[PDB]
């Protein structure tokens, strides 16, 4: 009976889509074509997401255990089997539900400077014709959208405060079972980062994947300051320096 032994949990707009694509190419790794099932997050969801274009998080998510298990029907011989939903990191009860099902699971987290991540989410919403406001106006609506139960793609600030989200995974799974990757390193050398993930997942590292407009300056300064205390906490949690996020 095929089941997942690793999860790519987020964060959203951090480049996990490419990471998933590259890992899937490995002959010893299987990731189903379904993304954003969010099975382990469902109990943390509001009754329904109310924002424009939020239908997907209501409709395309998988809430039934049997349907979730069927995602893995395509596994054949792969040692590493994984599933990717980008708000797994954000919803606070997710790690514990996963652990209760799969205590030996490994967790991949990819993080990006949360200032850039926020702008990426904004650009995504604009491209999809969900948001017509300026980024400045869109930022100002976050509190009211959280109250109104919009989906988390809209929460520019909340989704970027990584420290507590990552701590929850480290607490539940332990440092042995969690690997945190920085988007900037992945962008610079995706082959190296993918090979590092192979080592983490315990599959062969002799693999080469086939890898084939501007925020207002005052907002960049203000958002950098907003996230700064959380970033400092995160540095201590993940044992590495984040100075690249302060430039």
Give the nearest distance from C-beta 129 to Mg ion in angstroms.
Answer: 34
Report the DSSP beta bridge partners of residue 30: 81
In the bound state with Mg ion, the residue whose beta carbon lies nearer, of 77 and 217, is: 77
Q: Verify cis geometry, omega within 30 degrees of 0, for the bond prior to 48.
A: no
Is 29 annotated as ligand-binding?
Answer: yes
Q: Which residues in 25-44 contact Mg ion (CB under 5 A)?
A: 29
Number of helical H runs and strand E runs in the chain: 12, 5
E-state strands within the chain: 6-8, 29-30, 80-84, 106-111, 178-182
Give the nearest distance from C-beta 81 to Mg ion in angstroms.
Answer: 10
Is 26 annotated as ligand-binding?
Answer: yes
In the bound state with Mg ion, the residue whose beta carbon lies nearer, of 55 and 171, is: 171
Pairing mode of beta strands 29-30, 178-182 = unpaired
Q: Which one of the spans 22-30, 95-103, 144-152, 200-208 is the region binding Mg ion (CB under 5 A)?
A: 22-30
**How many residues in the shown chain lie near Mg ion by CB under 5 A?**
2
Stretch 54-93: interaction string toward Mg ion, x if CB under 5 A: ----------------------------------------
Q: Are 32 and 74 in contact (CB under 8 A)?
A: yes
In the bound state with Mg ion, the residue whose beta carbon lies nearer, of 29 and 178, is: 29
Q: Which residues in 164-183 contact Mg ion (CB under 5 A)?
A: 171
Is 18 annotated as ligand-binding?
Answer: no
Rg over CA atoms, the chain: 18
| Chain center to CA of 236 | 20
The Cα 115–Cα 100 span in angstroms is: 33
Residue whose Cβ sits closest to Mg ion = 171
In the bound state with Mg ion, the residue whose beta carbon lies nearer, of 153 and 197, is: 197
The Cα 59–Cα 42 span in angstroms is: 12
Closest CA relative to residue 186, chosen from 111, 122, 104:
111
Stretch 208-237: interaction string toward Mg ion, x if CB under 5 A: ------------------------------
In the bound state with Mg ion, the residue whose beta carbon lies nearer, of 120 and 207, is: 207
Give the nearest distance from C-beta 84 to Mg ion in angstroms.
Answer: 14
In the bound state with Mg ion, the residue whose beta carbon lies nearer, of 14 and 29, is: 29
Contacts of 60 (CB under 8 A, 6+ apart): 36
Phi, psi of 110 (to 5 degrees): -120, 130
Q: Which residues are annotated as a binding site for Mg(2+)?
A: 24, 26, 29, 171
- Which residues are documented as binding site? 24, 26, 29, 171
Query: Applying CB under 5 A, which residues contact Mg ion?
Result: 29, 171
């Amino acid at each position: 009976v095929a089941r997942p032994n690793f999860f790519i949990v987020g964060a959203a707009k951090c480049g996990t889509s490419s990471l998933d694509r590259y890992l899937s190419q490995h002959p010893d790794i299987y990731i189903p074509p379904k993304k954003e099932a969010h099975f382990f997050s469902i109990p943390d969801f509001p009754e329904r997401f109310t924002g424009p274009g939020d239908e997907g998080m209501n409709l395309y998510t998988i809430r039934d255990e049997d349907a979730y298990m069927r995602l893995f029907d395509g596994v054949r011989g792969e040692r590493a089997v994984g599933e990717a939903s980008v708000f797994y990191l954000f919803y606070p009860g997710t790690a514990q539900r996963m652990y209760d099902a799969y205590p030996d699971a490994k967790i991949l987290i990819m993080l990006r400077n949360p200032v850039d991540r926020a702008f990426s989410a904004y650009m995504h919403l604009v491209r999809d014709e969900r948001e017509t406001l300026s980024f400045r106006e869109s930022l100002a609506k976050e509190e009211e959208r959280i109250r109104q139960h919009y989906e988390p793609l809209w929460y520019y600030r909340a989704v970027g405060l990584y420290a507590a989200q990552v701590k929850r995974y480290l607490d539940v799974f332990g440092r042995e079972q969690v690997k945190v990757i920085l988007f900037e390193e992945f962008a610079r050398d995706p082959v190296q980062v993918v090979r590092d993930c192979c080592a983490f997942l315990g599959v062969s590292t002799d693999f080469v994947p086939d890898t084939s407009m501007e925020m207002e300056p005052d907002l960049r300064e203000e958002l950098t300051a907003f996230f700064a205390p959380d970033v400092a906490r995160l540095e201590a949690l993940i044992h590495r320096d984040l100075s690249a996020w302060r430039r």
